[PDB]
Design an enzyme around this catalytic site. Structure first.
Site, short mmCIF file in Angstrom:
data_model
loop_
_atom_site.label_atom_id
_atom_site.label_comp_id
_atom_site.label_asym_id
_atom_site.label_seq_id
_atom_site.Cartn_x
_atom_site.Cartn_y
_atom_site.Cartn_z
N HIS A 62 64.48 -31.77 -33.04
CA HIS A 62 64.08 -32.77 -31.64
C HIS A 62 64.22 -34.15 -31.60
O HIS A 62 64.72 -34.62 -30.67
CB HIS A 62 62.60 -32.35 -31.33
CG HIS A 62 62.30 -30.93 -31.59
ND1 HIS A 62 62.75 -29.79 -30.66
CD2 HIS A 62 61.38 -30.26 -32.54
CE1 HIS A 62 62.30 -28.69 -31.09
NE2 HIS A 62 61.33 -28.93 -32.21
N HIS A 92 59.95 -42.47 -34.64
CA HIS A 92 61.06 -41.71 -34.00
C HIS A 92 61.41 -42.32 -32.67
O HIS A 92 60.80 -43.19 -32.47
CB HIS A 92 60.76 -40.06 -33.94
CG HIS A 92 59.46 -40.04 -33.14
ND1 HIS A 92 58.24 -40.00 -33.43
CD2 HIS A 92 59.69 -39.85 -31.50
CE1 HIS A 92 57.57 -39.98 -32.43
NE2 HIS A 92 58.42 -39.65 -31.21
N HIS A 94 63.14 -41.70 -28.89
CA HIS A 94 63.79 -40.62 -27.69
C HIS A 94 65.06 -41.39 -27.12
O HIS A 94 64.78 -42.74 -27.03
CB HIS A 94 62.76 -40.24 -26.66
CG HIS A 94 61.64 -39.78 -27.41
ND1 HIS A 94 61.35 -38.41 -27.19
CD2 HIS A 94 60.47 -40.29 -27.95
CE1 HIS A 94 60.14 -38.09 -27.93
NE2 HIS A 94 59.64 -39.11 -28.30
N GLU A 104 61.13 -42.50 -22.19
CA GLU A 104 60.09 -41.56 -21.73
C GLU A 104 59.04 -42.27 -20.86
O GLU A 104 59.06 -41.79 -19.68
CB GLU A 104 59.10 -41.05 -22.90
CG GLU A 104 60.19 -40.06 -23.67
CD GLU A 104 59.47 -39.16 -24.47
OE1 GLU A 104 58.27 -39.61 -24.97
OE2 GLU A 104 60.02 -37.90 -24.42
N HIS A 117 58.63 -44.68 -31.09
CA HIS A 117 57.30 -44.44 -30.95
C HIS A 117 57.05 -44.66 -32.37
O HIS A 117 57.37 -43.65 -33.39
CB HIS A 117 57.20 -42.90 -30.53
CG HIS A 117 57.50 -42.90 -29.02
ND1 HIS A 117 57.48 -41.48 -28.46
CD2 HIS A 117 57.30 -43.76 -28.00
CE1 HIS A 117 57.64 -41.74 -27.08
NE2 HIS A 117 57.47 -42.87 -26.87
N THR A 196 54.29 -36.48 -26.30
CA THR A 196 55.21 -35.99 -25.03
C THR A 196 56.00 -34.90 -25.63
O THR A 196 56.94 -34.53 -24.88
CB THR A 196 56.05 -37.48 -25.18
OG1 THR A 196 56.60 -37.55 -26.10
CG2 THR A 196 55.26 -38.59 -24.48
N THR A 197 55.81 -34.15 -26.37
CA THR A 197 56.48 -32.95 -26.85
C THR A 197 55.25 -32.10 -27.28
O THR A 197 54.18 -32.25 -27.48
CB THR A 197 57.30 -33.14 -28.14
OG1 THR A 197 56.69 -33.33 -29.52
CG2 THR A 197 58.26 -34.30 -28.05
C1 LIG Z 1 55.33 -33.04 -38.06
C2 LIG Z 1 55.34 -33.55 -36.51
O1 LIG Z 1 56.39 -33.91 -35.92
C3 LIG Z 1 54.28 -33.46 -35.67
C4 LIG Z 1 53.54 -32.38 -35.64
C5 LIG Z 1 52.31 -31.81 -34.96
C6 LIG Z 1 51.80 -32.88 -34.19
C7 LIG Z 1 50.35 -32.18 -33.48
C8 LIG Z 1 49.99 -31.22 -33.67
C9 LIG Z 1 50.67 -29.98 -34.59
C10 LIG Z 1 51.82 -30.86 -35.27
C11 LIG Z 1 54.18 -34.57 -34.76
O2 LIG Z 1 53.51 -35.66 -35.27
N1 LIG Z 1 54.36 -34.41 -33.60
C12 LIG Z 1 54.59 -35.50 -32.67
C13 LIG Z 1 54.12 -36.70 -32.87
C14 LIG Z 1 54.35 -37.83 -31.70
C15 LIG Z 1 54.90 -37.20 -30.80
S1 LIG Z 1 55.14 -38.80 -29.53
N2 LIG Z 1 56.61 -38.29 -28.75
O3 LIG Z 1 53.92 -38.63 -28.45
O4 LIG Z 1 54.93 -40.15 -30.03
C16 LIG Z 1 55.09 -36.14 -30.47
C17 LIG Z 1 55.00 -35.13 -31.23
ZN LIG Z 2 57.88 -39.82 -29.23
#
Ligand SMILES: CC(=O)/C(=C/c1ccccc1)C(=O)Nc1ccc(S(N)(=O)=O)cc1
Ligand SMILES: [Zn+2]
Ligand SMILES: [Cl-]
Length: 258
Positions: A62, A92, A94, A104, A117, A196-197
């Site tokens: 992703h 990470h 986007h 985003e 992020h 956001t995922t």
């Molecule tokens: C291992 C892993 O990747 C993750 C697992 C996870 C996270 C939550 C629940 C179960 C697993 C995680 O941290 N997800 C995540 C982090 C930040 C953002 S965002 N784009 O909102 O910053 C989006 C996704």
């Molecule tokens: Zn993110």
């Protein structure tokens, strides 16, 4: 789950497996700079990354995550809208297929080329998996990237991407200093939102810096050579891994600055 960013498994499909996709505090959002209000109640933001211990970089199919040692308070975010101490666990990005899209969050509907992020979890919940089940469990520091001059502090990230081209690949990534990714100013907007995922959990205090960082065309072109697919599979370039703006609903975006 088989979610992604294609026509067939992209953000318009996520709600079928993740009904919270249509929830009351989804991210990202458009930041309307003329309705966000300066909030004098916000404490100064404290980014304490001096003792940050990076470990590894992972292509998760992703995006790619730079992972930190979060077994102690080594790299923390405090202050601004936050109560207590939030520990850096990973960052990470986007990004887009072209420089006119990729972020985003948007700012008066402006899309940036990419968005960084930095993900932190509230240490009063003991571990990240507990924190994401809480409405104040995470603080994500969002930083816009525009294409211009190179960001020297990003180059060590750009140079390892060849070694994690495909989904499931990781590489040792020690001694990386995330302070090299910050703009000069910590002026920010803040609002309550979500991952956001998938699984799109409504557990995030968003802190989005107003000042973008500049990266070079060559740096962002190397992001766009990554693959969503695993080794040996048909090549699907890792581009446009952004969720579009979601309804603001009953939320106010606060500015740290006049
Ligand atoms: C291992 C892993 O990747 C993750 C697992 C996870 C996270 C939550 C629940 C179960 C697993 C995680 O941290 N997800 C995540 C982090 C930040 C953002 S965002 N784009 O909102 O910053 C989006 C996704
Ligand atoms: Zn993110
Ligand atoms: Cl700008």
């Amino acid at each position: 789950h088989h979610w992604g960013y294609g026509k067939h498994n992209g953000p318009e499909h996520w709600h079928k497996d993740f009904p919270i996709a249509k929830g009351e505090r989804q991210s990202p959002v458009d930041i309307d700079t003329h309705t966000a209000k300066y909030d004098p109640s916000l404490k100064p933001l404290s980014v304490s990354y001096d003792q940050a211990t990076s470990l590894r970089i992972l292509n998760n199919g992703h995006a790619f995550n730079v992972e930190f040692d979060d077994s102690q308070d080594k790299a923390v975010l405090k202050g601004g809208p936050l109560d207590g101490t939030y520990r850096l666990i990973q960052f990470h990005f986007h990004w887009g297929s072209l420089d006119g899209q990729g972020s985003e969050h948007t700012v008066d509907k402006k899309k940036y080329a990419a968005e960084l992020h930095l993900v932190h979890w509230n240490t009063k919940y003991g571990d990240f998996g507990k924190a994401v089940q809480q409405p104040d469990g995470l603080a994500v520091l969002g930083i816009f990237l525009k294409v211009g001059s190179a960001k020297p502090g990003l180059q060590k990230v750009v140079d390892v991407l060849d070694s994690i081209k495909t989904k499931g690949k990781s590489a040792d990534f020690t001694n990386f200093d995330p302070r090299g990714l910050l703009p000069e100013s910590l002026d920010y907007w803040t609002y309550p939102g979500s991952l956001t995922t998938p699984p799109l959990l409504e557990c995030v205090t968003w802190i989005v810096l107003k000042e973008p960082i500049s990266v070079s065309s060559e740096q962002v072109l190397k992001f766009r050579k990554l693959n969503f697919n695993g080794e040996g599979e048909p090549e699907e370039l890792m581009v446009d891994n952004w969720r579009p703006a979601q309804p603001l609903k009953n939320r106010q975006i606060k500015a740290s600055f006049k």
